[PDB]
Symmetry: C3
Subunit: 88 residues, 3 copies
């Protein structure tokens, strides 16, 4: 049921922000890639759009802590989500 799946992808995206605030940047990246992959297979653009919103919030959190490396990492996942969004 794709609606249970939408809820699952939404929760993963929110945890991306939570983990950026914690400095667990690689884990947040992992969660965002799994949102992208799962959303591109099941063709759900709105899950990707929400992911992009949340990725912007994670950039906020990392800038606030002056972590440029984490910002780079998050921004790579951002560009990937933008490509996948365009194709959906």
């Amino acid at each position: 049921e794709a609606q249970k799946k939408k809820k699952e992808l939404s929760k993963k995206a929110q945890e991306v922000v939570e983990l950026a605030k914690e400095g667990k940047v690689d884990e947040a990246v992992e969660l965002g890639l799994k949102v992208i992959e799962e959303a591109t297979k099941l063709g759900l653009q709105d899950a990707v759009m929400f992911l992009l919103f949340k990725l912007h919030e994670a950039v906020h959190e990392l800038k606030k802590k002056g972590n440029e490396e984490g910002v780079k990492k998050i921004e790579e996942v951002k560009k990937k989500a933008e490509e996948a969004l365009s194709r959906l």
Copy 2:
């Protein structure tokens, strides 16, 4: 018709930002809950997506003013809107 409701909810979403700018955070919270309720009963996904965009702008405005209690209130309503978007 449903176009009228979509524009109305967009209007309320913009006012949330203006109210946040003027320090009227309780009122902005109230308008934001209203947007969630109406879009949720009309199944308007993009209405909530737009509201989320505007809630981020309201957080920007309250950070500029160093109003962290306001930021908390807005983020509480943001969490609620995110929840509704998952179910939509």
Copy 3:
């Protein structure tokens, strides 16, 4: 055909941020307007959502250079995008 056009407008919204970053505000404004117009004619609400996301990124960039005029210009383009989105 739909995916080709959606992809072109994704790239245009990205080039908006590029041109803001390189300090070409006028050029970003005009590209943003062209995106709104084409998106509107074609009924492409998701393209306008993505454009709004990128215009907020353009604001981020311009406030980073402390360029208040450019910000005002980009934010009125944002207001145009928000209205068109309301009617889509």
